[PDB]
Design a protein around this ligand. Structure first.
Ligand SMILES: *C(=O)CCCCCCC
Length: 14
């Protein structure tokens, strides 16, 4: 459920 498109700059867990 966690996707990082760019790396550690964008964290999305939903
Ligand atoms: C968790 O393992 C699921 C991650 C898939 C991307 C989440 C946003 C669609």
């Amino acid at each position: 459920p966690c996707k990082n498109w760019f790396x550690k700059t964008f964290t999305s867990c939903k």
